[PDB]
Amino acid sequence: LHKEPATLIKAIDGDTCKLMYKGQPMTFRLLLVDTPETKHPKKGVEKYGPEASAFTKKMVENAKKIEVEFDKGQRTDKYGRGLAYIYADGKMVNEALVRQGLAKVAYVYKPNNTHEQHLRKSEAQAKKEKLNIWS
Ligand SMILES: Cc1cn([C@H]2C[C@H](OP(=O)(O)O)[C@@H](COP(=O)(O)O)O2)c(=O)[nH]c1=O
């Protein structure tokens, strides 16, 4: 996979944000993870939702460098959102959330699963430490 620079425009929630990519603003959704809902009335404001939003926000707003890394399959979902692994100063936001118990590994659609094993390994650690979502 190849990392590419992006510029933070606006953090939305734990797993969705707006970035300036290749000159154009675009919304991104983190690959292989799911942070709790804070919008959509059908899901409601789920537990740890606000926590996940704050974690992501802090991490991306304080970063000197943000990079996007598309996987090997489709790069956007049905809603026109870019699907990527996002790095804040070299640290993957996707993994950071999972390791903290702020997100679950989900939506594993191949072949967009290059980092699946890595994220699962972190999820198991968060689980055995009964962190947040796993408490
Ligand atoms: C992470 C991811 C989400 N999605 C879809 C699945 C869900 O569709 P539905 O809206 O049909 O449930 C939605 C989950 O994202 P949200 O967690 O932002 O809702 O976006 C993909 O299609 N591919 C992906 O890789």
Ligand SMILES: [Ca+2]
């Ligand atoms: Ca979500």
